[PDB]
Amino acid sequence: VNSFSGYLKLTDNVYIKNADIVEEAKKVKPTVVVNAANVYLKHGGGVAGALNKATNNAMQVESDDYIATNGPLKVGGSCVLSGHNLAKHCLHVVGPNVNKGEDIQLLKSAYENFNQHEVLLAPLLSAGIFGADPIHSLRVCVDTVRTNVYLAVFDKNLYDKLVSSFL
Ligand SMILES: F[C@@H]1CCCN(c2ncnc3[nH]ccc23)C1
């Protein structure tokens, strides 16, 4: 049993809810919240800017030190950093940004990072400002992630489309 509430079940391991991932984090304090990161961990808008704002910029300060030491992530890659006031850990995952020309095949690689964590609160990767058509992205999450993932989708019309459309 876990603390996630109101989520609708899609599969054995994937659950979905209309909610802001940041609000899901403050209430649940999950072990892992996933950030929709870029390779520079520059948390400017969407999931990353909203998560970072909720940490009072502590996520950005920590991320700048990580990049200064390690250099940029790979598209499709991830790193584990603090969850600050939102979660124990934040898994920063880089889905491909269609609005920068990145190979959408890298979306499966991105979601494979989730399998290193037994339970996660996450957004749909490469959705929103990353330019990623959402049905494919969900078909990839369900077909890739084997661990227990609680998806918070902020746009109700998109939630509606996905929940009303998931095969
Ligand atoms: F907005 C886009 C579209 C739907 C997905 N999405 C989010 N999903 C959950 N939580 C969120 N908080 C801030 C953004 C956000 C990004």
The b/e string for 84-99 (b: 16+ C-beta within 10 A; e otherwise) is: bebbebbbbbbbbbbe
Q: Tell me, what DSSP letter sits at residue 68?
A: H
Please give the Cα distance from 79 to 93 (Å, whole number): 7
Beta pairing, strands 78-82 & 89-93: antiparallel
Residues 6+ apart with CB under 8 A from 71: none
* Closest CA to ligand 1's atom 6: 154
Residue 16 φ/ψ, nearest 5 degrees: -140, 150
State how far the Cα of 142 lies from the Cα of 55, in Å rounded to an integer. Answer: 29
Cβ-contact 83, 115 below 8 angstroms: no
> N- to C-terminal Cα distance for the chain?
26
> Do residues 106 and 144 make contact, with C-beta atoms less than 8 angstroms apart?
no
* Phi-psi category of residue 24: left, alpha or beta, with phi > 0 → left and psi -120 to 50 → alpha: alpha
Neighbouring CB atoms inside 10 A of 61's CB total 12
Ligand 1 atom 3: the closest Cα is on which residue? Answer: 128
The total number of structural domains that make up the chain? 1
Q: Are 166 and 138 in contact (CB under 8 A)?
A: yes
CA of 123 to the centre of ligand 1 (A): 7
3-state secondary structure of 5: coil
147: which 2 tokens? 């661990």
Query: Which residue bears the tokens 């850990």?
Result: 89
Count Cα neighbours of 89 within 13 Å in the Cβ-side half-sphere: 15
The strand ranges marked E within the chain are 8-9, 14-18, 32-36, 78-82, 89-93, 119-122, 148-153
166 φ, ψ to 5°? Answer: -65, 115
How far, in Å, is the centroid of ligand 1 from the Cα of 84? 19
55: left (phi over 0), alpha (psi -120 to 50) or beta: alpha
Q: What is the C-alpha separation between 152 and 120, in angstroms, rounded?
A: 11
Whole domain around residue 1: which residue ranges?
1-167
This structure's resolution (Å) is: 1.0
> Rounded to an integer, what is the distance from CA 82 to the centroid of its chain?
15
Q: Report how far ligand 1's centroid is from the alpha carbon of 167 (Å).
A: 22
Decide if 120 contacts 148 (C-beta within 8 A): yes
Picking from 108, 78, 81, the residue whose alpha carbon sits closest to that of residue 93 is: 78
Q: Is the minimum distance from the CB of 158 to ligand 1 under 6 angstroms?
A: yes
Q: Which residues pair with 9 in a beta bridge?
A: 15
Helix then strand count (H, E) for the chain reads 6, 7
What was the structure determination method? Answer: X-ray
74, two tokens: 């790979």
Q: Using alpha carbons, select from 79, 71, 85 the residue that is nearest to residue 110.
A: 79
